[PDB]
Design a binder for this molecule. Structure first.
Ligand SMILES: NC(=O)c1cn([C@@H](CO)CCc2ccccc2)cn1
Ligand SMILES: [Zn+2]
Length: 349
């Protein structure tokens, strides 16, 4: 049944949106937090979704569940180990996972997220507990794994902590910075907090990705390329509404992190119109296929590939192409990158 039963590479998936309902339950239960439901299966279809939603409704999902893990050392390391296990069963050989460390913290973080009380788990500790879970995961499951830390659009005052964290934990396992949250906040790409984080990133040799054009206008993409100096785009789909920027981004071979099932579920994509990934396929653009938030979308990687095979004509050949563009556009050291590419070229013939 899998649409593409071969190794893949995944560059766009959020750790906080890729937790096992069973673990949420565990810590919830064990901590007295208080879930909407008390068996694995019920939680899942409560946090899960199958229609487009408001934005408020989407964000509220992270309340149900986040307080159960945030602030808890055990569970922070556990989600990270368990993530890698999950990517094994989808057949991935290399994945970059991303998350905001402030958002699992309950100490030396203002405001404190999710209405937590103040404990003693810091953002910097959060990054080493995820590093541990990810590295012990890699060694047991056979997936090569790096991470990316996210600044958050609405909170530019965390962002220099972000980059400083990327440089502090670099290749152990953090290899890049991202910018995540509400891309429609006016001006948010240019808040000086985020600008100067991404200029430190250029000056320190940290890779950069940014979510832009998933639901913002193409001017948001243009700000991520020209001012934050991004190297890849999260989604990038409204890039098509600006012909000259589209044409220039194909020209320099910009990588687009595409997330098709997520894009229908969130509204980003209207069912009555060509999906932007078909335009990309036909134009030969550099893009990847990715899950975003498997927990919210009740998906695994094969969901994305079954959508595009089924409902869009995608062939094995295209599949192979796109994973090879992923590996080529990953944020690994060049020696490691070429090692990856060898693994896939061999598997693919
Ligand atoms: N799909 C997404 O946009 C997304 C964002 N996150 C995290 C960072 O990885 C933040 C989610 C969040 C929700 C509500 C308030 C603040 C942050 C996870 N998935
Ligand atoms: Zn995302």
């Amino acid at each position: 049944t899998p649409a593409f039963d071969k190794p893949k590479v995944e560059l766009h998936v959020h750790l906080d949106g890729a937790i096992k309902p069973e673990t949420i339950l565990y810590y919830g239960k064990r901590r007295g937090i208080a879930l909407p439901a008390d068996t694995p299966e019920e939680l899942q279809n409560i946090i899960g979704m199958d229609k487009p939603l408001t934005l408020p409704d989407f964000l509220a999902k992270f309340d149900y569940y986040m307080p159960a893990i945030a602030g808890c050392r055990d569970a922070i390391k556990r989600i990270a180990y368990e993530f890698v296990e999950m990517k094994a069963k989808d057949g991935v050989v290399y994945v970059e996972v991303r998350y905001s460390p402030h958002l699992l913290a309950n100490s030396k973080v203002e405001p404190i997220p999710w209405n937590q009380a103040e404990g003693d788990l810091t953002p910097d500790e959060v990054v080493s507990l995820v590093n541990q879970g990810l590295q012990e995961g890699e060694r047991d499951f056979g997936v090569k794994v790096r991470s990316i830390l996210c600044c958050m659009r609405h909170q530019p005052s965390w962002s220099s902590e972000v980059v400083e964290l990327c440089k502090k934990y670099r290749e152990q396992t953090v290899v890049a910075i991202d910018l995540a949250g509400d891309e429609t906040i006016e001006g948010s790409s240019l808040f000086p907090g985020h600008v100067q984080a991404y200029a430190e990133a250029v000056k320190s040799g940290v890779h950069r990705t940014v979510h832009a054009g998933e639901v913002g206008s193409a001017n948001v993409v243009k700000e991520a390329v020209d001012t934050l100096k991004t190297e890849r785009l999260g989604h990038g789909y409204h890039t098509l509404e600006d012909t000259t920027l589209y044409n220039r981004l194909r020209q320099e071979n910009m990588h687009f992190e595409i997330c098709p099932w997520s894009s229908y579920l969130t509204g980003a994509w209207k069912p009555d119109t060509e999906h932007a990934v078909i335009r990309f396929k036909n134009d030969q653009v550099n893009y990847s296929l990715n899950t975003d938030d498997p927990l919210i979308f009740k998906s695994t990687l094969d969901t994305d590939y079954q959508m595009t095979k089924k409902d869009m004509g995608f062939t094995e050949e295209e599949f192979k192409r796109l994973n090879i563009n992923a590996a080529k556009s990953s944020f690994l050291p060049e020696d490691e990158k070429k090692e990856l590419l060898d693994l896939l070229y061999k598997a693919y013939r």
